[PDB]
Amino acid sequence: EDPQLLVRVRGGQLRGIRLKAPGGPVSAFLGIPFAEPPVGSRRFMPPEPKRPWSGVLDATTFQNVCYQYVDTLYPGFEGTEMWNPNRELSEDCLYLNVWTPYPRPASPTPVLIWIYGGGFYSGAASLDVYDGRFLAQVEGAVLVSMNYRVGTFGFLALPGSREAPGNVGLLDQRLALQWVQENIAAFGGDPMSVTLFGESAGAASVGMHILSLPSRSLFHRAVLQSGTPNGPWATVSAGEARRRATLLARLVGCNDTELIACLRTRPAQDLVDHEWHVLPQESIFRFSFVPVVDGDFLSDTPEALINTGDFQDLQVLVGVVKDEGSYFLVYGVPGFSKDNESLISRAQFLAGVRIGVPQASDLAAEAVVLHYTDWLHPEDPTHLRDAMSAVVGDHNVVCPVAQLAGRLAAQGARVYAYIFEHRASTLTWPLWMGVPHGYEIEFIFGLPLDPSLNYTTEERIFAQRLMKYWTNFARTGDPNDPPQWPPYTTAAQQYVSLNLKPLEVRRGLRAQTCAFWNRFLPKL
Amino acid sequence: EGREDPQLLVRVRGGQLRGIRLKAPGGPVSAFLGIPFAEPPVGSRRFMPPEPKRPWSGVLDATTFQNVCYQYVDTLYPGFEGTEMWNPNRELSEDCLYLNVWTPYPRPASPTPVLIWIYGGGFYSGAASLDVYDGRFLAQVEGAVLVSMNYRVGTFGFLALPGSREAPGNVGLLDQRLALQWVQENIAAFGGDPMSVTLFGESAGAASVGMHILSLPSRSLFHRAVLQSGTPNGPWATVSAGEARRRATLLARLVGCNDTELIACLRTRPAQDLVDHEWHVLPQESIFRFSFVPVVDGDFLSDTPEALINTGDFQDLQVLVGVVKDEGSYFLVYGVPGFSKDNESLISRAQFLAGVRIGVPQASDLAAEAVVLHYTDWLHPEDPTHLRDAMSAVVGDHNVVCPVAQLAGRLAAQGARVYAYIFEHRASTLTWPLWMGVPHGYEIEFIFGLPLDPSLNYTTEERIFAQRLMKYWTNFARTGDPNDPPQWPPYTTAAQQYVSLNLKPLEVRRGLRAQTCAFWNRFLPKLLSA
Ligand SMILES: O/N=C/c1cccc[n+]1CCCCCCC[n+]1ccccc1/C=N/O
Ligand SMILES: O/N=C/c1cccc[n+]1CCCCCCC[n+]1ccccc1/C=N/O
Ligand SMILES: *[C@@H]1O[C@H](CO)[C@@H](O)[C@H](O)[C@H]1NC(C)=O
């Protein structure tokens, strides 16, 4: 009975498992319950704290993945399968994971808390690319990750109602942070130094924690990778959420209270079966159930809140990958597939824009088209394909990120910004997709330190650098090891390219183009 | 005759002429200056089509420039070469319909290609007798026959009550057309070949050339065309029949005046009175528009130029078009607040916004916003040097560069052989400040070869450069191809190739401000609609 693997938290005793990292052992505590299972009458409801338990709770294995749709687009294809659930689905899914140095830190160690993405309809803390062992071993970090409800279970709201308030998926994450304040010290972690990091929808989630006062006392620093609380996809108005919830209720055969009672009687797989039809669409740009501007968790729209916020004592690292848009396209944009080079026509490009910017009027659509057409090669299929990617990535990620960076910096935050440009040698998506979002994650978590995953030796050195930047940032609010990475500011607009070459400092994050999205389009 | 130089006596349809032997650097040329081609459009003929000149008796002396057409005289910088060189250099008069011919000396024995110059000046000014339009060098060095004509400007040339008989519009254009006819009938007397006539002009001159292309009765009078920094399409070169009616009616009121009675009252106004009011007809801080320009009358112009270049068949046409490096800079010193010849004209963002309202007076608030956002440098949105240069680009692109790109594109798509250039050499003798770069009009002295005159103090390289240009233009006049048999490829819609003209050899470039001209030529219009 290894004492390094026995920990007492407020709810009782836990036994973890000693795991192997390339450089030595780590202690892992997997599948720790942090809430009462959100089932039966608790579906759609805020999470309640986990009741205390007797004896020694087995925390040696990942718990169930929160009930969700599973992507079937390319059955057996690595590129897709790696994001799919790797444990059983279940509404009973509120568990977090902790990795620590073995033996557990002498003194309080900075804590990083990961929050996965997945568009608010999918994701899981148990995916291999979120494995915390490398950060724990090589950098001595205490790493935490939590499951949170997605889809209808997490974000279906009847705003103003008592039994389906909206944002419960974000309350899930908040309860895991609270759990960290209360228990992490028992693992050798410092509750006084907590850094949130997340990607895509996890990044937006981190954002929403920044913008929601009750979360602010639970972390000190934040990293948003390829996602933001602002922008087209991450939030929905109270009105529009009510509409979607009602449409979905109707789609499954169902006064708020009665409606919600009827939904609660539905088998999980029924809700998922109809999730997507609430917003008929050709691709995956919008999802029906995402966080709602409830005037509670989010007192106002993220736009309103970031423009007027005071961010004096906040440090933030944010960044994008080289090809934010490419991933989206293979999911229902005609002309695009993983299996050919996706050289598209002009006509296809125009229709692509109606899909990627679903909210756009005819005029707005044309402005986009005319901006992104290369007038020297108006009909070159290669240009059109790359442009389609750019439109979609700029509108959804790159410009929302540039705008967040700018507002935080203008309003007191210390901000660092990056563009990630290395394409994993092991990517199974085609070359034309470049560096799609999500494929920086495995480097940050240090997977290339595992020789059995067959990354190049430079890729290993690269991963070591990133783990340093991220953990330096968690330690100190500054990614530089104690050329330099300069703070992003509104004046100079400096960010850095992360790739195999040494840090390069650049200025202006798609500045002209983001002025188009952030200043002009709105007026239009 | 008897004792006079036998090479200077020539007969044209209207009578006998005595020209003058002039010295050019490489030897003598024959000049015939001030030949009347119309009845003086004075008195009851004001605002009317030109009538062909009635034959005279005796030997008309053709040894000096004739009157300059009545016009506003620029008084922005008294004494300043940079403004003065454009100012009238002969007496102002309504009696001003004369043309000029330069020919080799002795006159060529076989028929020689004819170049006809049409000056610019916003349709409110200009004269064929300015020094920078001196035909002597082209005649002496290239053996060309060069012809230039005065045409009516301002109200005299363009005041229109569309539909009236007494003031139908476009008579200034009709003056040019009459001179083209006079060349068809008479140029052979000078050794010129009426079967080889290339029109060339700059600014309003170019827009003029473009309108002769667009107007069928002019098309039989010439074979090839050069448009320097101007086009029949674009925001300044034409007005609608309704708008022209409105302006003439307003001008009539400003001076104290049924169309017949109105025009009769105008005809009693002293020329200087019309001139003193023409600019009030359209209140503006700066010279981007003029009140009296070619009108779309459904006659001379059967539709808008925009429509005609979209629907036109131009298979037979060879055309040379281009722009100078800084088309906008000139405009700014004429009343955009913040801008001056005497300082570096660093401006604020607010001055830039305000400049954009003035430079694009037709823009809604949204359109103006789009323009500002497009031309803003988002890395340094507040930098006064970039803002100054962006004000110049906005006004240059909207008024000349983009109308020219659109012109080259339409013509090329529709059968024409097009050659395109951007001229980037700033004369060493220029008296405008450096910040203005190469303002429009400052390629002209090189095309006309002034730097071969050693007394003008151009550098040796400028002299070699001017020869290059004279060769390009006259090869084009001769053969439809500026190349001498590095190459100047035609401009096409696939490749969009054009050349830089400067002291270095030809360099081929692709796309004439392509992104930005997509903004002005495709997007802005639609923003107009909403
Ligand atoms: O809840 N309904 C889900 C559903 C059902 C039937 C058809 C389509 N959907 C949407 C999403 C499909 C899977 C899309 C997931 C794409 N993806 C997977 C992994 C990593 C990234 C991404 C997309 N990045 O843009
Ligand atoms: O006919 N009305 C004339 C007038 C009267 C009172 C105030 C202003 N105006 C307009 C024009 C002033 C002179 C502008 C001439 C500028 N300019 C001269 C020579 C060569 C080029 C240019 C301008 N190029 O853009
Ligand atoms: C330059 O001259 C103009 C006209 O006098 C003036 O309005 C402007 O403020 C001056 N600009 C600079 C940069 O000195």
DSSP string, A147-209: ----HHHHH-B-TT-SS-BS-HHHHHHHHHHHHHHHHGGGGTEEEEEEEEEEETHHHHHHHHH
Strands A189-199 and A89-90: unpaired
Give the tokens for residue A156: 């279906």
Identify whether the C-beta of residue B356 lies closer than 8 Å to the C-beta of residue B368: yes
DSSP state of B108: P
Angle in degrees, 0-180, between the axes of helices B271-278 and B241-255, rounded to the nearest 10: 120
**Cα(B231)–Cα(B225) distance, rounded to whole angstroms?**
12
- Cα A264 to Cα A121, A152, A256, distances in angstroms: 18, 11, 12
**Cα(A315)–Cα(A401) distance, rounded to whole angstroms?**
15
Q: Which amino acid, residue A148?
A: Y
Cα A443 to chain centroid, rounded: 16
Q: Is A239 exposed, middle or buried (0-12, 13-18, 19+ CB in 10 A)?
A: exposed
Place of tokens 């050709």: A282
Which of B378, B523, B530 is the closest to A370 by Cβ?
B523
Pocket test for ligand 2, best of B87, B251, B334 (most atoms within 8 A of CB): B334
Strands B239-240 and B224-228: unpaired
**Cα(B143)–Cα(B136) distance, rounded to whole angstroms?**
10
Within 10 A of B16 (CB to CB), how many other CB atoms are there?
Answer: 16
Element (H, E) at A386: helix A381-393
Active site residue A324: yes
Within 10 A of B220 (CB to CB), how many other CB atoms are there?
Answer: 10
Q: Which amino acid, residue A98?
A: V
Instruction: Give the CA radius of gyration of chain A.
Output: 22
Which of A363, A376, A519 is the closest to B373 by Cβ?
A519
Give the tokens for residue A54: 């007797």
| B482 preceded by a cis bond (ω within 30 of 0) | no
Cβ contacts of residue A384 below 8 Å, gap of 6+? A343, A344, A345, A346, A348, A349
> What does residue B321 show for φ and ψ, rounded to 5 degrees?
-135, 160
**Cα(A367)–Cα(B366) distance, rounded to whole angstroms?**
13
Which of B366, B496, B518 is the closest to A523 by Cβ?
B366
**CATH number of the domain at B1-530, out of 2.60.40.2240, 3.40.50.880, 3.40.50.1820, 3.40.50.2300?**
3.40.50.1820
Establish if B494 touches chain A: CB-CB under 8 angstroms.
no
- Cα B71 to Cα B173, B206, B243, distances in angstroms: 16, 19, 22
Cα B225 to chain centroid, rounded: 12
Cα B517 to chain centroid, rounded: 22
**Cα(A499)–Cα(A158) distance, rounded to whole angstroms?**
45
Give the tokens for residue B46: 């004001």
SS (H, E, C) B413-457: HCCCEEEEEEECCCCCCCCCCHHHCCCCCCCHHHHCCHHHCHHHC
**Number of residues assigned to chain B:** 530
Angle made by CA atoms A458, A415, A312, in degrees to the nearest 5: 155
**Cα(A368)–Cα(A356) distance, rounded to whole angstroms?**
11
Cα B520 to chain centroid, rounded: 22
Which ligand 3 atom is the nearest neighbour of the CA of B345?
13
Q: Which amino acid, residue B315?
A: Q
**Cα(A436)–Cα(A417) distance, rounded to whole angstroms?**
18
Element (H, E) at A26: strand A24-33
Q: Which amino acid, residue A99?
A: W
Rounded to a whole number of angstroms, the distance between the first and last alpha carbons of chain A is 67
Q: Which amino acid, residue A314?
A: L
Element (H, E) at B104: strand B98-104
Strands B98-104 and B145-149: antiparallel
Closest CA to B389 of B375, B373, B368, B403: B375
E-state strands within A268-307: 292-293
- How far is ligand 2, taken at its centre, from the CA of residue B287, in Å? 6
Q: How is A450-511 classified by DSSP, letter by letter?
A: -GGG---HHHHHHHHHHHHHHHHHHHHS--S-----PPB-TTT-EEEEESSS--EEEE-SSH
- Cα B456 to Cα B74, B87, B453, distances in angstroms: 24, 19, 6
Identify whether the C-beta of residue A306 lies closer than 8 Å to the C-beta of residue A230: yes
Q: Is A287 exposed, middle or buried (0-12, 13-18, 19+ CB in 10 A)?
A: buried
**Cα(A30)–Cα(A143) distance, rounded to whole angstroms?**
11
Give the tokens for residue B394: 């906005």
**Cα(B410)–Cα(B309) distance, rounded to whole angstroms?**
6
Residues B440, B443, B445, B462: which is the catalytic one?
Answer: B440
Identify whether the C-beta of residue A94 lies closer than 8 Å to the C-beta of residue A145: no
Residues B30, B129, B203, B286: which is the catalytic one?
Answer: B203
Cβ contacts of residue A120 below 8 Å, gap of 6+? A150, A151, A154, A155, A169, A201, A287, A289, A290, A291
Angle made by CA atoms B220, B192, B14, in degrees to the nearest 5: 80
Per-residue burial over B374-399, b if 16 or more Cβ lie within 10 Å, else e, is bbbbbeeeeebebbbbbbbbbbbbbb
**Cα(A411)–Cα(B46) distance, rounded to whole angstroms?**
68
Identify whether the C-beta of residue B380 lies closer than 8 Å to the C-beta of residue A514: no
Cβ contacts of residue A371 below 8 Å, gap of 6+? A513, A516
Give the tokens for residue B186: 């008479």
Angle in degrees, 0-180, between the axes of helices A201-210 and A168-183, rounded to the nearest 10: 70
Q: Which amino acid, residue A494?
A: Q
Give B36's strand partners.
B98
Cβ contacts of residue A296 below 8 Å, gap of 6+? A165, A167
Identify whether the C-beta of residue B208 lies closer than 8 Å to the C-beta of residue B241: no
Pocket test for ligand 2, best of B72, B278, B395 (most atoms within 8 A of CB): B72
SS (H, E, C) B164-232: CCCCCCCHHHHHHHHHHHHHHHHHHHHCEEEEEEEEEEECHHHHHHHHHHHCHHHHCCCCEEEEECCCC
Place of tokens 């003008």: B456
CB contact under 8 A, A375 and B530: no
Give the tokens for residue A468: 């340093």
SS (H, E, C) B288-333: CCCCCCCEECCCCCCCCHHHHHHHCCCCCCEEEEEEECCCCHHHHC
Give A497's strand partners.
A419, A504
Give the tokens for residue A99: 């990795």
DSSP 3-state assignment of B151? coil
Place of tokens 């972690």: A189
Residues B142, B278, B327, B424: which is the catalytic one?
Answer: B327
Which residues in chain B are contacts of A511 at CB distance < 8 A?
378-379
Within 10 A of A254 (CB to CB), how many other CB atoms are there?
Answer: 17
Angle made by CA atoms A360, A365, A370, in degrees to the nearest 5: 155
Which residues in chain A are contacts of B496 at CB distance < 8 A?
376
Strands B295-296 and B318-324: unpaired
Which ligand 3 atom is the nearest neighbour of the CA of B339?
3
DSSP state of A255: -
Instruction: Give the CA radius of gyration of chain B.
Output: 22
Identify whether the C-beta of residue A172 lies closer than 8 Å to the C-beta of residue A35: yes
Which ranges in B18-160 belong to alpha helices (H)? 81-84, 136-142, 154-158
* Listed resolution, Å: 2.4
- Cα B84 to Cα A386, B336, B504, distances in angstroms: 53, 21, 30
CB contact under 8 A, A376 and B526: no
Angle in degrees, 0-180, between the axes of helices B171-186 and B204-214, rounded to the nearest 10: 70
Identify whether the C-beta of residue A7 lies closer than 8 Å to the C-beta of residue A16: yes
CB contact under 8 A, B519 and A367: no
Give the tokens for residue A112: 């990083």
Which residues in chain B are contacts of A360 at CB distance < 8 A?
none
Fold of the CATH domain A1-524? Rossmann fold (3.40.50)
> What does residue B292 show for φ and ψ, rounded to 5 degrees?
-115, 95
Q: Could you tell me the sign of the dihedral formed by the alpha carbons of B92, B93, B99, B104, in that order?
A: negative
Give the tokens for residue A295: 């005037």
**Cα(B63)–Cα(B522) distance, rounded to whole angstroms?**
51
